[PDB]
Structures are given as structure tokens and as C-alpha cells.
Subunit: 240 residues, 4 copies
């Protein structure tokens, strides 16, 4: 069971990913292609590189080039500081290879939108949000129900369970309408294992908190993954 990705493996992975992005017209500047864009969700997932990203095997891994992550604090009424973290502007391109996933997780503050740039995205999610604290929350459009998963979705071994709660399915393609994923909703997507290209999608969402706009913003955790193993990973990718 591999426990890390080699330097060559990582660089080629993010270097191909970077060029594929620019071609697809995304402003990926070298500053952004770094030892953090490449993500492996868990020590169990480093086996993704035992056969390669073109192996078509079910693993939790991806690359994320972030071009923007504006807090949007400036100009906001002082009385809005308490809730300023539920706002903000994040823009990032994500690259997922055939068969690979972006593990089941939900965000307390972040609300995301998806725009397929290349390939097809099989989105999985829970139509019901999670009750984060006894506090009262607003409603409006919520998350619709969606469709039944298509047959044959191979899930990473040992993470089979983390997908249970994500009953709703959705197939987003290039050209489709923008898809909104409200905070507090369990989501996860994958690139069809039999894809001919890597899934590529522009994520326009609210601020991305990653472990100072405001003092109370200091190291906030906004990523909550079902499978605990995934949590010990998103933090960084072990590169030899």
C-alpha cells in the first residue's frame, strides 16, 4: 500500500493538469501550480498512483488551481462581521481523472456552483442539509431531489460507506446551466471511469476556509468529510 506520491509523479500530474487548464482557457499562473494543488484524500488513497491516474480505478484524488479567494470584507458594515465568513468569492478549476472522486463532504459556510469545462461530471449529494448546531437557519430554494445513481459506479474500497447519505445523482455536462450546491449539503462528484479525458470544472463558490480577514476567521475549518481518513489528508499530499 503506497504511502506517498513521488516527486516525478506529483509534478507530471500537476504539470499536465496545469497545461490542460490553460488550454481550456483558465488563468492558471505558475504561482498556483504548487505542492498543494495536488490532493490525495487519505493514506488509503495513495494507491491511486500504483497504477496511474489513467488506471480508471476508484480513488479519492484531484488537483485544484485556485485563482481567487477574496474574503469580501472591505466595505461590509461592521455589524456584518459575525456572518462575513458565509460570504466571500472563491474561483478555482478542478481536475479529476477517469474513475477518480472528490470524497463525500459538506461545508458549513461555503456554497458552491459547478461549470463543466471538459468531460462529464457525475455529481452525488444529499437532498437534505445537515443541522449544524441548534442555531436557526434560513431557507429559499434548497436542493432539489435529482436522480437515481446510474448502475456501475465503482466507489473507492473502504470508503464505500461515506457515500451512503448521498442518494441524489446528477450528470452535469459542458453547456448545462450553472449548478448550485448549498452549504450544509453532503456532496461528492467523480469523472466517469470510462472517460476519454479528465473531468475539468470551474468552481465558483463563497470563501474557501483552509487551515486574517477578521480575528474570528483565524484558522477556520469549513471542510467536513464523511470518511475520517479523508480528513487526515486534504491537509496535504505526501510527496517523496
Amino acid at each position: 500500500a503506497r504511502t506517498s506520491v513521488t516527486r516525478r509523479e506529483y509534478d507530471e500530474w500537476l504539470n499536465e493538469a496545469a497545461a490542460l487548464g490553460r488550454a481550456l482557457r483558465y488563468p492558471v499562473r505558475p504561482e498556483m501550480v504548487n505542492d498543494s494543488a495536488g490532493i490525495v484524500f487519505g493514506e488509503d488513497q495513495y494507491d491511486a498512483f500504483e497504477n496511474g491516474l489513467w488506471s480508471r480505478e476508484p480513488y479519492e484524488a484531484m488537483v485544484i488551481f485556485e485563482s481567487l479567494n477574496e474574503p469580501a470584507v472591505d466595505g461590509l458594515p461592521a455589524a456584518g462581521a459575525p456572518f462575513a465568513e458565509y460570504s466571500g468569492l472563491c474561483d478555482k478549476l478542478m481536475i479529476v481523472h477517469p474513475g477518480k472522486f472528490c470524497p463525500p463532504h459538506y461545508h458549513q459556510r461555503k456554497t458552491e456552483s459547478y461549470e463543466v469545462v471538459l468531460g462529464e461530471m457525475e455529481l452525488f449529494y444529499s437532498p437534505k442539509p445537515v443541522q449544524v448546531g441548534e442555531e436557526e437557519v434560513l431557507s429559499f430554494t434548497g436542493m432539489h431531489e435529482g436522480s437515481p445513481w446510474p448502475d456501475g459506479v465503482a466507489l473507492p474500497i473502504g470508503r464505500e460507506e461515506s457515500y451512503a447519505a448521498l442518494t441524489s445523482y446528477r450528470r452535469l455536462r459542458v453547456g448545462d446551466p450553472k449548478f448550485v450546491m448549498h452549504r450544509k449539503h453532503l456532496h461528492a462528484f467523480r469523472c466517469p471511469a470510462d472517460s476519454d479525458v479528465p473531468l475539468v470544472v470551474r468552481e465558483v463558490s463563497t470563501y474557501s476556509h483552509e487551515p486574517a480577514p477578521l480575528p474570528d476567521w483565524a484558522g477556520l475549518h469549513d471542510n467536513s468529510f464523511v470518511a475520517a481518513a479523508a480528513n487526515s489528508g486534504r491537509l496535504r499530499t505526501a510527496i517523496q
Copy 2:
């Protein structure tokens, strides 16, 4: 002095603009190409169509295809409703022809980011925000100073003044970093008059209020144009 755009003029304008968008890989669906995307800022500006969009003359006009404008209310703490309008997710592509402008204006709630897809964008703005009400506002990164205007920027006749306060300049190109324009800041951009293609840019910003997420969101005006004439226009484009 023409006082409206003919049906053919408008359709060709938005239909070229629509195709140009899809080619540049923006998800412009026909639903979005409507009698509203095409905007003429003021009765004084319908003269843009006397010689055409490729006349290279200084006029205030543009097309905006909006793919997303999510309120981001769902999942927000009830106690955040008062400030929920300062958040939200808007995604739109804008097309500005050579010599044309997006008139001087500022938003009280909206914070924008720019990503040049095609061409070059000559951004003009005021380094100081405006004092909207006696209420207290937050700070953090603010707006940097920028550079002096390049010589020879022809401004639309009769609107010469509205650009005065926008002393800071900036030339954003394809590939450059995401450019953030904080709310309360006077902004305005143009496509260089001697351009060979239309300027095209992806605007990722906070919710765009246009004349119901929450009761108090009912018909909110978040667009404040310097030149009053521009105001009586953004509302709609007179098409014969």
C-alpha cells in the same frame, strides 16, 4: 440622434456576442440570449448604432450573459438575513466592442472580480470607496492605487465628467491574476478603441440586484451610475 436599436441590429449584436462566448468556452445557453443582455447606457448612447459596434467610437454599451445569480440564502443563519444581500454568487460574461465603455458606477453591496477571456481591458476606478450612509464599514485589503491613465482615452461625449473621480487605471490581460473590485468603489472599463476583437471578460461577483430571496430584498437597487443619463438606460434597451 438615434433613440433606439433596430431588431436586426440588436439580434446580430447579441447573436455574434453569444457565439463568440460559447467559442471562448462560456456556457451561454439560448435562455440567456434575450432582449435584456444587450445594454445601452442612456438615450445619448443609442448613437453607437449609427455607425456600428466596430466604428471604434466612444459610447456606453455592452452585452451581459448571466449564467448564475444565486442568492446564497439557504443554509445561512437566521441572524444573518440583514446582511445576506452583501453576499450571493453572480457569474456573467461581458462583451465590450472596440472603443466602447461600461459607464462609471459603484455598487453598495456587490464586490466584483475580473478575468479577461479575450482582448484587453482598460479598467478605470477610484482608489477611495464612497461613504454610503452614516453606518460603520469594515476594512482589510481595500483598493490599491494603480496607474495613471494612458494618453488618448476617448470618452463618450457628454459623459466626459462622469469619469473624473475614476483616477486609477489598470490594464488587465488574459492570463493575469484575478482582479478584485470592492463594493463602494467607482469603476468603469473599456475595450481599447484600436482593438482587433471585442473585449470579453468573466465577471465573478456577489449577488447582482436588478429591479424574492428575502422580503427586504424586494426590488433592490445596487447599481449607482455617475452620469444620471446612464441610470435611465441600464433598465432596458429600446428596440424597434
Copy 3:
């Protein structure tokens, strides 16, 4: 019945076409955007501009940006001069708006290939080549049969006849294999009248003779259009 295209009409037509080209990644340099790229096939066809290129009306018109047209004479054996004209390298992008056609014609020397860049191309042609002279010609792969025309192909009024001989149909899309159109074959294509974007296609073919590589190449006519009217046009477009 309009008998010419105005300067603004022409410029806007080729200027939108030019930018759409670069966006689709075709090397359209300004030298190429000239008073010749825009083509109207016959005086009967200037009525295309009566309602516009977005009229969706059946007319023979198009724009052709030629990036290459190499004779490929250098390095060729002296003994090959007689047949050097059937060789050469031409590279051009073509833009056809919804409902418009590229009139029925055949080339004696030129053999073309099509690559759909944007939109869909409805190709019409004759499965049998024409007997040009009593001279003996070679064979090999020839032109396959193809399919029946789909219902509802509106043809330009008065040119209805010139399409008779082109019984074979073919719908080429972006991604499809390269389609080869051998010389001596009657062809003509159009952009589906109900298209949402202009048809755009990369034509890679042999040398394009337009009214000196070799003395005998001096002003050669390699374009032979069925409808006589089309012939007196391809020469130039009447611009006011």
C-alpha cells in the same frame, strides 16, 4: 433586390467572423481580414443583407480567411511541372451563418478535407465525379454514397436547380473524422438554418487557384459553379 453590401455591413460581417475565428483558435491575422474574404455568390445573393446574416434565410454567401496557399513547387522534379497544379497546400477557415450555403461547384485540380470547428455542417455532393476532358484519370478510394437529404432543406430561390446533381448528403460535426472531397466532385454545404452559432470549418486542401508558381499556372480557373450566376460573383463582393 439589393445589389451590394454596405461598408458597415461588410466590415461587421468580417470583423465578427475574424474574432470568432481567433477564439476558435484559428491564426486569423489582420492581413487576412480584407475586402475579399467576404464572399457573395451572385447578384441574386446580395439580398442576404436585406434582413441580415442572422435572418436564417437561404442565400449563397460566406467568409474565407486563407492562412496558407503554398504551391509546393520548390524541390519538385522538373518532370512534374505538368501536374504540379494538382498538388500544393491550402489552409483556410470558413464561416457560414444559419441557413446560408456555399453554392454547388466542383474543382478540377483541388481536393479538399473538412474539419468542423464550430456548429454542424450539412454537406451535399454528387457521388460521381465529372469527366473533365477526354484525358484518362486515376482512381482509388473515390467518394462513398452517403445519405438522403434530411427534409426541409430550404435552398436559395432561383438556384434550386444547381443542387439537383448533389444527391448525396452528410452531416459532419466537431470531433468527427476528417472528410475528404476529391476533385471533380460536385459539392456544396450549409449551416442548418436553425443553428445557434455560425458554422465554422477548417478546410485543408490542395492549392487554391484564384484569378506565378509556373508560367502555365498564370491565372488558372479551378472553381466551377453549377449556377452561372454564382460564377460572376465569387470574383469579388460589391461593397458600397
Copy 4:
């Protein structure tokens, strides 16, 4: 000294190259992505894979997706068969990684054109053609002189000499005019070692003879590489 490329190495190499192609809008169909597109020029060059394609090391290797290679025999006068091989239509996209080369070689029949799709191409060539046989050859535009090589062009070890005769230099970029390379001219290009993306270029040339349009076309060799070692390779790539 590695003497072959592993299955995974090969696949990932061509799989990334294939998707990069489609993104840049080239019609790369799966049939085209095969155990031949990936090319290693010589057993001395398999060490390219010891550190990877992103090693930035000087090696002779590349991938070539061929979409068209029409003989253009059909419709040609019987009396033209002797010279039909100097004609034809080849269309292919080529992918060269940072620091890698396309070894010095010349073609007796083929004449090529280059169009940079992505990156920058540093083309090297000899301004004088080679005298292939006592036969007489035609002339017209020939090959201009060009420029001095830029300092610091690292050449693959052991092949340093094969570049000597290619004294003329040229830097072709996206948007530049079509570049024509006449047959009988020694050429070779590379992607700048410090490139951020792989060089990608559309090669539109005459028929590409690879070891039956006409009987005398049977297995013709039109590729003549300076370094002998390169010749024993282009034939096939050793994959474990």
C-alpha cells in the same frame, strides 16, 4: 540506460497528450491514440523516461496524432502518377514537452507547414536543400535564411552533431503566419526547455509515407534523419 517505456508511462504520455489536443480543439479520436503516436527517436533516447517528460532534459521524443493522410490520387491524370507521391494531404497535431526535440531530418517528397496551437516552437533548419539524385528540381520561393540560434539550446547528448547543418533558427508562436518547410530541407524543432506547457502544433503537409495508392507507393521511405540512431527508432516505440 533504459531501453523502453513502460505501459503506464506510454499510456499516461499519450492520454494526457490526447486530452490536451481535444481541449486545444484538435479532432483527436480514440482510434488515433495508439501504440504508434508515441515516438522515441532512438534507443539512446529512452532515457527521456528516466526522469519524465517534465524533466526539461534534451531528448528526442514526441507524440503525433494523425487525423488525415489522403493520397489525393483519385481524379489525378494518369500521366501524373510518377509524381503523385510529392502531393497528398496530411494533417497531424504534434506534442513536444519542455526541452524535448523532433530530431534533424529532411523529406524528399513531403513539404510541411507549421501552426503553433500552444506554447512556443524553436525551429532549426538548413537554408539550403539537399541534392537528392542527379535529377533536376524546380524552384520558386525556397527557404529564407532566418536567424542565429538563441544561446543555451541544450541538445541531446550524443546527437550534438546531427544539428550542425541546421544553422538557421526561427521562433514560431501562436498567431504567427503559417510557416512552410519545403521538402529536401533539413529541419528539427523543440519546445523551449523552460516552457510551462507542452509545445503543440498543427502540421499541415503533403502525404506522409510511413513503412496502396499506387504500386510504386508500396512502402516508401520519406523520412531521412541525420543521426543514424534516430532512424532505427521512428519505426516503433519499445513499450514493455
